[PDB]
Design a binder for this molecule. Structure first.
Ligand SMILES: *[C@@H]1O[C@H](CO)[C@@H](O[C@@H]2O[C@H](CO)[C@@H](O)[C@H](O)[C@H]2NC(C)=O)[C@H](O[C@@H]2O[C@H](CO)[C@@H](O)[C@H](O)[C@H]2NC(C)=O)[C@H]1NC(C)=O
Ligand SMILES: *[C@@H]1O[C@H](CO)[C@@H](O[C@@H]2O[C@H](CO)[C@@H](O[C@@H]3O[C@H](CO)[C@@H](O)[C@H](O)[C@H]3NC(C)=O)[C@H](O)[C@H]2NC(C)=O)[C@H](O)[C@H]1NC(C)=O
Ligand SMILES: *[C@@H]1O[C@H](CO)[C@@H](O)[C@H](O)[C@H]1NC(C)=O
Ligand SMILES: *[C@@H]1O[C@H](CO)[C@@H](O)[C@H](O)[C@H]1NC(C)=O
Ligand SMILES: [Mg+2]
Length: 490
């Protein structure tokens, strides 16, 4: 597997077959797949260098791991996009040996430059990925180059983790499965050769090529993108609160949730679907919250300041099953988003919520990730306005803003899912650059589909479903009052 961890360094070498048996359109699919793998690899904030080599009769090195630009995601993707298939027009045979020997030469050059005996050289783990149809037909057996690489890298039983070779035929093309299998590593309990229809399928397989099991620091907003992973692996910030409500881990000891929920907190755990129970040291409930604040004047429930923090009695161990989500307006989120150093909270709100309709998610009672569209600007006004049909909860509503204040994000239109009562307090979040950011938390709505089964409202069912989520960008003074020494705010 390709290991994602803090200690050491990862060199990834991407070998793209530009031989005649691969059409220009196939090659574009190779470039698309390579770009995704680069984007994903850079999402973990680990120490990684990427080489890019295209090959047919002879290899062409577009990016070397000796070059400092190989550690810069933008330079890497650019060398990739600047890769032309026609640069191999006069040698269109398939010399897989020579492509692999190009990697060998690079390894030789690097070892020389760093020193065989140094930890700078010995700490590097090497992952080679060939995108090819596996139809080598010149240059001799690739095994010679494989064996040279195993030798220079001193791959023994103790150093088996220092080398992985993958051969992947992605696209509609005709592939020789036997050569792919022969090229790939042979490791017990793992596969190193794949035949995949498209980049979409590659994205799924790549998640299973990565071993993130030893990434146990507090890195935020990291999850699993595989449809085959567990719910908790997909959303490891997710917690259940038994006072039922949901919440989000925002550090290794603090949980963000809704005030209206108010004990045990159930946190992800790699050892069972059942999670791990935590007790609470301290709860901090917003003093503004009073659900009956407006009751005497005909707004029977009011959710202004619906926010709470829980400090757990012990620290959570970070794992594939338990991690903080990223909060906007922090330095950690700024880095995840790859934005300028001096960015402000306003900049993060612009970064994340720029469109009039922003695809977002919340987590269901059963752990499933569900979809919503947050409506911004003019569409926020139309989204929120339908509360004026809710005459039973709001018999005395003179202005929409008496119940749907600027503290709330809005969703629930068209084909959106709508949170259930027990989903309250859970994160409303978005994915950007393969990282997850909490922009709000589930507070209230006009329709409870659960009042694994959710009912849709009838199209006639006045008022229609509509959902209102405390907006984290509107709660900064309170969050900062309480978490100033927990998180690193911009
Ligand atoms: C219906 O809702 C409106 C809007 O909030 C209330 O009227 C508001 O009352 C505030 C002070 O409470 C006042 O400063 C606003 O000018 C006024 N807004 C509007 C648009 O009129 C109603 O509150 C009731 O109505 C009177 C007349 O305004 C208030 O003076 C009074 O305090 C209040 N009645 C009581 C004793 O509850 C509200 N209607 C009801 C029946 O609650
Ligand atoms: C998305 O979640 C997947 C499902 O959990 C992850 O795939 C799992 O990765 C694990 C770590 O590499 C594998 O763990 C085991 O490691 C031991 C010892 O190091 C091996 O001996 C075992 O063979 C292996 N598990 C066993 C007992 O077979 C899991 O095998 C593996 N599961 C599957 C279905 O592939 C993905 O890594 C994860 N991806 C991301 C990006 O988070
Ligand atoms: C292919 O060979 C021709 C003739 O020598 C040459 O003019 C052309 O530039 C070559 N193409 C590439 C990509 O080098
Ligand atoms: C979880 O709930 C979703 C949403 O209704 C549903 O599609 C899915 O089938 C459920 N998962 C399980 C385990 O049944
Ligand atoms: Mg070929």
């Amino acid at each position: 597997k390709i290991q994602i961890q803090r200690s050491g360094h990862l060199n990834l070498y991407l070998l793209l077959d530009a031989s005649q048996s691969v059409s220009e359109n196939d090659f574009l699919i190779f470039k698309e797949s390579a770009s995704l793998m680069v984007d994903r690899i850079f999402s973990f904030e680990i120490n990684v260098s990427v080489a890019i080599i295209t090959f047919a009769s002879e290899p062409k090195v577009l990016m070397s791991v000796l070059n400092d630009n190989s550690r810069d995601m933008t330079e890497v993707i650019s060398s990739l996009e600047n890769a032309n298939y026609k640069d191999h027009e006069n040698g269109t045979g398939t010399n897989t040996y020579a492509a692999l020997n190009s990697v060998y030469l690079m390894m030789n050059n690097q070892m020389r430059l760093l020193g065989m005996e140094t930890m700078a050289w010995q700490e590097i783990r090497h992952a080679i990925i060939l995108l090819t149809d596996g139809k080598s037909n010149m240059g001799g057996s690739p095994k010679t180059a494989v064996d040279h690489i195993r030798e220079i890298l001193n791959i023994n039983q103790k150093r088996n983790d220092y080398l992985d070779i993958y051969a992947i035929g992605v696209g509609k093309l005709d592939v020789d499965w036997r050569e792919l299998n022969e090229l790939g590593s042979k490791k017990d309990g793992e596969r190193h050769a794949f035949i995949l229809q498209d980049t979409k399928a590659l994205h799924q397989v790549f998640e299973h090529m990565l071993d993130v099991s030893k990434l146990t620091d507090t890195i935020c907003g990291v999850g699993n993108m595989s449809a085959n992973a567990s719910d908790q692996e997909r959303t490891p910030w997710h917690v259940t609160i038994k006072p039922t409500c949901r919440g989000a881990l925002i550090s290794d000891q603090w949980v963000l949730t809704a005030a209206h929920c108010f004990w045990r907190v159930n946190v992800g755990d790699p050892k069972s679907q059942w999670g791990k129970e935590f007790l609470i040291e301290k709860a901090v409930i917003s003093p503004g919250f009073d659900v009956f604040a407006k009751k005497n004047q005909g707004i029977l429930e009011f959710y202004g300041d619906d926010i709470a923090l829980l400090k757990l009695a012990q620290k959570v161990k970070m794992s594939t099953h338990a991690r903080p989500i990223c909060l906007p307006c922090t330095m950690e989120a700024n880095l995840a988003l790859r934005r300028p150093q001096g960015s402000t909270c306003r900049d993060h709100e612009n970064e994340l919520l720029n469109k009039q309709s922003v695809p977002a998610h919340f987590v269901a009672l059963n752990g499933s990730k569900l979809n919503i569209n947050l409506k911004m600007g003019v569409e926020w006004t139309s989204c929120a306005e339908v509360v004026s049909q809710e005459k039973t909860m709001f018999p005395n509503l003179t202005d929409v803003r008496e119940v749907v204040t600027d503290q709330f994000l809005c969703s629930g239109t068209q084909e959106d899912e709508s949170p259930c009562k027990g989903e309250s307090g859970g994160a409303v979040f978005l994915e950007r650059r393969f990282r997850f950011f909490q922009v709000g938390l589930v507070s209230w709505g006009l329709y409870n589909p659960c009042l694994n089964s959710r009912k849709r409202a009838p199209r006639s069912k006045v008022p229609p479903p509509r959902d209102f989520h405390i907006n984290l960008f509107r709660m900064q003074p309170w969050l900062r009052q309480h978490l100033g020494d927990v998180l690193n705010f911009l």
